[model samples]
Target: EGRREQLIAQVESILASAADGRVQKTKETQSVDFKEEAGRRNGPQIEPGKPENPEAADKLADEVACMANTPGGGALIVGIEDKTGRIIGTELDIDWLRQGIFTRIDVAPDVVAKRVLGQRVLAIYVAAAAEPIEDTSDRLRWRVGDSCRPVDRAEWWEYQRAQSGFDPMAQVTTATLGDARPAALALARKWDPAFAELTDEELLRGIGALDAEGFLSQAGKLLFTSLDRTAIELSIFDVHGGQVLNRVVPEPEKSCLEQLDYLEQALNVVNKNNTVVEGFVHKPVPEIPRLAVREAMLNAMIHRDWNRSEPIDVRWIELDSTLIVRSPGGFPAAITSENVLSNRAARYPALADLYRALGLVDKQGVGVDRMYQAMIALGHRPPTIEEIAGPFVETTLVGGRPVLPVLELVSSIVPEARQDDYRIAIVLYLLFQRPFITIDVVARGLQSGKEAARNALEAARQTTVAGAPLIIAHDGVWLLGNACREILRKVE
Candidate 1:
């Protein structure tokens, strides 16, 4: 609903701009398709308070049919004319014009009328047709270019299957419930106490992973694949000061259910320093915030394009003090680094539901933000995300230095709500050369106002445990908590 609403808002915004002269009707792309009253415009034209032009009405139907055939749909604005970049308004019988298109077009096109620069603007919104739309001759036609002729159905069906936001996880597979393993189901209950009461089959059905016919969808295979399958791989290397080919630590393959446990176990046993730096106070935490590592694991597991068969690759470079998690397949459709944190739709919604109901990650699509906040709260540089040549998504995070008795535990902060003050303080602490910071710096860190920053931190939430206070006002300085003063003073 949120995404659909956004699309509707976007289409309306385009019409508003073209109507109000903020932009030329012809100048938008990536979503909007423009129509103007001209010989060049292959749509029906209406003379204000007069009959609708038949030739253009037929053309308008084709335009709607074109968008109906195209994925992600489209919005068309009629009655705007431009002469070398100036707005030329047209008068049209919006109702009659819409009626003509409806009578001619094969698919339904939403039509409305609005005042644009005090002139009549006809707006037509068309959703992508699920099935092929035939033209006036009852011939199946699709949009090629602007007003491009729709030839035969050479590649139409293939294109339809590639529409945006399609979830591969929902597709049916021959794999069945017999493929499910007991341990995979147990992991869900481990994350959520509420899940403990449901029977395994019942739980699977509630999450929409199991079919009525008792078949496991592709989503099921990915989530609860056999334990012996090599779906995830992690490698650790031992080197010092750019030393030579050295010890290579390899981890065996396991199902998605058990992938993280082994990686954490390996990471825990190998890094004998008994601590990794986390939080602004430089606390020597027991390990990289476990949830932070889980984010990398879950993120890599969930976002793959599914056609790729290679197991996820993970590298923990002890020499460089970094963890690199690589997942096969290209980035999920409609996902890009710029809009990655918020705009990433669930690549596999069934898997998304499977994880969220069991508390593996958020259902609200904050996986990227969770990863980022985990690093910042634990006193580390934010992880780096890259799309390498395999079109693969790779994430790397180096270790950080930390400690307040009352520290920023992964449990202490909420990534969904921590975007403001709490993260602000940690980010500024990392950026500035000096440890000392004022309210202004904190505000800068929050990317918000000083008041929002000051009030953003719930003083109580940053504690070492449930109720201890980690954040305090120190002589009007928004400093890291006093618990780690001695340690940070020496380091700073």
Candidate 2:
């Protein structure tokens, strides 16, 4: 069948599986009734009415705006009431509502919404257009209760400024730099104590946080001020595909400088022991350039979409000898993995500006190219980027030995065991070498291990109808059994 038909069938199945009132049907369209399901959840609410109050439109706008501003924007079910649970409807034209929503928000990143299905009731799904929008006042605002609250204005302005091809750190902010974390200040001091010597206004000016008038720039806020709430989550898995390690660190709210430090720490944890070099040489191995890894981590942080609650995730698979850095949002504009190293400009300037100021990143926009070159220079395969779904951008870095031998062995045993099974075998081989391997290690290595490993192990152990002794131990330590040995010999 065609892709559209397949999608329609999948969606139909989903609708069929959903409980009544969870999904409402309108002719050929299906609407997930959030009012009956996720109304109490902390997000925008759809209140049904004709917008009797002049502020009703504003309120709806705020709801839509806030939802867009928040991570993973949500929908606002108009023409539905929370109190009486009624589909009251609205007088505002759906097209007009969409236009007003697009125009009124002062964010630089645009937002898009669609009226999925409506005759008596309207369902609007507001999503982040490309990036988060910063309002005209240089601040992005979201609705919390009846009040409209402003977000990091400096960050917003920096994003817009960057979009216009201006360096984020070049923009200035009027907000005074208050006492931030001492650790962050100390690190900044280390970069340049003169920066610490300057007054708050002077420091802002020096760091591009303030313009001539002492106005705070988004770059300034993200770097030095107590703003810029981004997060980085790290996960390390064993060869068995079990989660051996995981950590989540919120990018420091007040100090962008501090956030980078935290990010570096996280990177170190994920990569510390995984380094492999020949001999006692002081230089890094050709298989995985340290700089390439660093650049990949920095790129993930700089380009990731902060509007999504999901943090920039760096997952290390020791057994597979690969690192997968997953960031929120896919490639910006025309950028893709195939052309990521073509010296394209970044999508988020404010975030990039802070990194530049700290001298963590190169300013030539050759970060991806540098990563590629670094890997090539070290005789390692270049990193690969994969954009899956609409929100996930993954960069995979291959490290350690090539799996050609494992592939050859697997194919010799079961001719049907193609490249994929060889890859799995390679992963399994790595896990077996570890002192201990768990199910979580296997799960993370395969990316679907939790459900697949048990059956895989069973298949590996099967010698008869009763099954072979493929798994020697299962409680804590699992070792390959005689049956597994026989399979390995066959493959070998």
Candidate 3:
């Protein structure tokens, strides 16, 4: 009787003929047309040939307004025959429909609508423009079973009372240029000394502190000029003694350059004891590349979230032979611990762009990639990226360790290798299990044809405790060879 049932019958007929089987069809079904459902949901319905009518526009507004005023808003479907449950498409222009809907809904929080599903039948989905709709009078009105009402009064009052906290850049300032801290200024100079010489207005603009209109930008005020009026904070820690290494007080007159210089000096107090290994007599060079440390620091500063008002934290740790730097934010979206080396874009594009212009970071998404390459060049394992709880990213650098082994003995031992060999190697390393047992068990796990599995077992036979193929002739079970025995004895 309905379109959906007709389509189902057609499908069943085709299947019955192809499979040469009898198909049973059910008769009783639960189906309701659009108008009955819309009325039940407290939403409106527009009939055909009513596109340009004022009453139709008002009804559309009422539906969205009702949803918004109540817990949340709902929708109205426009193009379907109300009686027969058939789709007789409407002649409404999409833009006109949108314009009509937008004109009628008026509340501080706005509601929006568009044709979401387009076919012989048109469907529109509307959501409450403002959240937690309290009173009906707050926006356009809606009709429930027998009454037309506004949103709840309590919700309306709460929405009106919400606060939009302080704008950091608009804070008042009193300190003059002369009072700027030299230590902070030195860092600004290191990044760009030319920025240090600019007039107050020029310096602000140069470091992204001021806009073209000469007003302070949020970044400039937070980093340099408005410390007295704002609560921007920075902390440095020394790993050697597990103590706070340094702290600086507010000085509104300071330039962005100056603040950076102070941060650099404080960081150095913790990082200065780093060691560098000498190269061989024929090709002597520093053991760890310097760029690795720079990239790590740059990444830390560029990606921190500034919206939360929390101070950016930097911690330096000195192990027996390694140097570790922990920065404030974790890896950005799509960059988890497993895929750290994979190419990905930074989450904070605006912040990263500004840092790149200052030559503080790489323009290409190569901060972590470069760190890895530099570590390998200097004979150290690549740095690790981690996400720590309580809103921060952590980066660890392990120094004084060889990046790669001269002879990768584990990989070399596998003779007739397959995918499972590498997987088994990883499992053995992680579980600290005996390697000989791993080789035999992994070989039998291969599920190709019997011939393939047999060939894999025969190759594994080369690494047994004794020279012969230690197979039980009656049972056809295999064991490890002499070479494996020698390695297993060393590991034990």
Candidate 4:
């Protein structure tokens, strides 16, 4: 909703600029396209039958299709000369224009008549289509950069399916309560002792792992039986992709929960701990934060492509204290590496829910946030999450010894209550590198919107170091306060 308004505001600014003075041709953005009438425009305006310029209606429908297929949907400001950005004016009937697009494509845009720069114009607002939209020519083309580009129909459908939140794990299977393996059930109770008192059916039903007809969902089968292969495999190496010092791959007969339990045990053995001095406390901090490791593993198993049978790969480089987890799937719809920290969506929500209910993960979907907070607080670089050529999501956490200086400075500057706050950690991380923390940088760092960044910064400002605020706003940028700077200099 805000996106469309923002596009409309941009169009208004353009029209307002054109009204005040002559304007040059503007570059088309992903959200806004400018076009003059394309079909027969020489004749007088006709009723809502076929447009006088049927060609114009056809061309408009194609542009609408492109916009509708775009991520946020977009708008086309018609009646403007495409090449010159001059108001050429459009006499196309609004009803005809609206119907023309609906008849030619899978979506219908709201067409509003407007007078821009004293010329009649049509403001066509296209909404994002739930499915891939095709133009009148039956071609799949979505807005790419500033133009419409032909997209593979199959690829489009596949991506859409991924985004549809259709969890195969939720589908009912032939397996029943009898298929629930004793070992897997015992492992689950180990994670959450409360489950021990409940009957197997009660526990499974409470978590929606079992259906009403006495059958288990695919998720239940994976969790309670050895129906699925080991979802994760880990290898400990001397260095990144180096010779394997140790390897852990669970038996195919092991349930997903049992496999995860075994893998985590292997990880804990290799994930060494180091003592770090914070204030008067000497804390035993692991080389890689245990929470970070668990979250990474959980994310990999819960969100990976179920269609792929290969195990999620975990490479642990002991020499560097680095952990690399590669899940067998690209990020879910609209989720990129850039937004993974802030945006939360599980490809298989059913599996995610099961893990959460069993007390294996954070229920608020802040696992990634906790990962970042734990790593940065321990003076380690934040995890590097990216998508590679194999369409796999790879998350790499590089941790050596903790940076004592960073830890000391952060502890001194940030209040004890806010020390564990993820937002505060992000702010401190950015402030450590640069003196100023702009909202845009904070937004990206937090994987959040500007307003959320604003709130985070504001929250940080309330924190105190030696009774002085930790951060102060200079112009529009947030900078370290006097107390923080003094502490930082001393730590440096």
Candidate 5:
């Protein structure tokens, strides 16, 4: 139903130029191995040919199910050379292939067989599976590189257990309404009393805390229960990584929301002696801004992968002037290192929605801007959000001048309404970090096409933003105007 023949064309384009970095396979690679001479090589996923027996069809089905398990959904192309990545046409049956994948794979993945250069390829488009899908043998596999491997069954069970944490106060032994604290509930109520005064199942379902079933959602676990499962690691070290000042692995476990509370509380305790000068003022500002610490925690927790066993880690090295939060999962597929600042990607959709309804995080992702604005206006370089070591995301916030009159100085010049625009906000954030950027660099930063970046850069001058010319460019390099400046230097 979702085929834009252009998608098929994209695959053909990739095959036509394999040397153009098209055949490289990562977990993120959407185009898969197409058959060259025979068929795609049989591995954990691909099978040699059309299924002739029940066992054979079941193996083929298993591969299809594994495709759904991929974090980035991919195609099982059936016509290109497996070794050389060359296209070898298959004079095979499309109807039977589609029926076998559906009945045997046991999921309704769309199957299409199309002809390219007189050779036809079969594509099974399995949507990124919301729930874990299994084949006849009850096998579950995850796409690792070019192949799928059977995932640990126990891990797989947890992966699907409380998916997308969206639940209300519950009575389950694992997680219950009794697990929620008064303060958290009070906050939720203030955000949406419609949910709090919220009477029964009607209120629960409306809040998305309860699914059609009476059982509370995984979200309930994050908000209410001890969340015995979730864990985070916190550490403080000397500026250049000498002796460890302190480290905490929360004892007796804690819930997701409580983890935030504890982590923030711990951060304040460690940095208690921290201070900053306010533009020659007699006094030093106290500690890194609470907004920065708390924002990092909320961002880490709400966006983390609940299925992963490794704890989210927050590390601070004073004097080195950076705080890092490493969480178990990278962002949603729609988000990448470049566009993270530009998009509000919620890996836990249902949970994130409930968070918004409860007034925790914004749906469109304003917290990021707030973080950027607070840090930059206060004279710090912008925060960094990016993936790490394949399965995790790391965020870094460089320390900046604190509580300076400079914040006021910058605020007076930077437009309040203008920060709402992501492009404007990012360019403004970067203005302080670097002297100038190229249109290509801008495209990389915004995770946008070159044309879009060119248009944005060109438009920066024509449009009046933040009570200043957003940017001025010359010789293909871009920079902010005089109005945006490096301040925070003045005498008492």
Candidate 6:
């Protein structure tokens, strides 16, 4: 706690110097760096929607990655000259800058607009990641005595091992293949059909569920055996917290796989399937995408702390038309709600590995990203994953009536046969909400740096609506083309 206050005080002192015009004389430290707006050819300030030197954004991301590797974390004051420390001020959007850094370094930083000497500037706060972070080029780096230097993963892990604790999932359990239930085995086989060819013991060994002594691991016990207590309890309400429409609780005899399957089936029964009638075709789309729901369930199962006695609480309500899932345990490692979408950490590597090996989860562990893309693609807001008191994770997905114009625009204007790309979906969503957008808006939405945002906009330009471009760029601002707007207006 004392260290935290020290870092805050250091940043405060730096801000004071900038306001007094003595900022240029201040020395850069390991925890504090100064930067000016990128691509500012001349003038006292850089305006929004102006073309920037591509190298500038790239270099900023690299510096941010290095700063994030600092032992106590650090802050970057933008709009101040690095060499001279002149407070020139900046017009770069804060969120836009934050997303660019996050997309490039895989580290999410808090970028806020600060007024120094009546000038708008950016204060980017970078948090130290639990694991070493890489730049856009995938080069590992850390702050070494006020300089960014290359670091090896093994060397990084050596430092981490000194401070970190053990993973509970790796512990061996007294339970073995004898405790496994046939139903759970069958469910496992469903994910990987070839599992039938391997004997039960062979399958367990294949997934690293068994130890050298043939004893089941803690993760294996949770995966294969029946739980003594309920794993999940789901409730549906006609209105939020109103009279219960129905409640579904899995039997204690069911394994985690069976419990997930049963609960998802129950959710499906209540999930509304709204139909889109166009000419002669009738297409059915769920109020919330089914893929998002499945991924949420998978996450709840694999990530929740198995040591906790409490069951995961899931609720479906119509008042706000939302699905809320409360899973036991806080986010694993250095993961916070802010960086969950961009960073990956394993609270239980063995359990996650078993799921991935069984083909139940993504090999890259990007289920959260998938959920975000799926919900936003269907004109619904992205899922909110928060860590609440009780050291628990609560996920909320709001699904009401889908926005027809946005949905139609995404389905038709995007060149993809299926609109699954998050970047494109985010761009379309922003365009629908605002009259016009700039690279910053796209960067903030995609959580991708300016370059990726630029590429996404170019991709949209290639898409045609009524034989015309779907989007048009003017003076670095992008807007929906007239033909695309016509289709949306008709839909609305």
Top TM-score: which candidate number? 4
lDDT of prediction 3: 0.42
By TM-score, the candidates rank as 4, 6, 5, 1, 2, 3
lDDT of each: 0.56, 0.51, 0.42, 0.75, 0.59, 0.73
- State the weakest 10-residue window (summed lDDT) of model 2: 106-115
- Mind giving the per-residue lDDT tens digits that candidate 2 earns over 385-407? 88978689988888764233332
The C-alpha TM-scores of every prediction are: 0.52, 0.44, 0.39, 0.65, 0.55, 0.64
Give the winner by lDDT: 1 or 4.
4
Candidate 1 lDDT over residue span 150-198, tens digit each: 6433244335435644556655677777777777777766767875787
The best candidate by lDDT is 4
lDDT of 6: 0.73
Alpha-carbon RMSD of each model: 15.3, 19.2, 19.6, 14.7, 15.4, 9.8
**Deviation (Å) of 102 in candidate 4:** 32
Worst 10 residues of 6 by lDDT: 157-166
Q: Candidate 4 on 185-276: residue-level lDDT in tens? A: 88878779888789888887766677777888777888888844778889889986568888999888888888888899989988988887
Better of 1 and 4 by TM-score: 4
Candidate 6 residue lDDT tens string, 168-222 = 6655789978998888888888878877798988887766676657787777888
Error of 2 at 10 (Å): 58
Residues 219-328 of candidate 3: C-alpha lDDT, one tens digit per residue: 44445443442122344444556676565433435443444444555544444443323343233233234566667666655555655455455444444334454444
Task: Rank by lDDT, highest first.
Answer: 4, 6, 5, 1, 2, 3
What TM value does model 4 have? 0.65
lDDT for residue 477 in candidate 6, whole number 0-100: 90
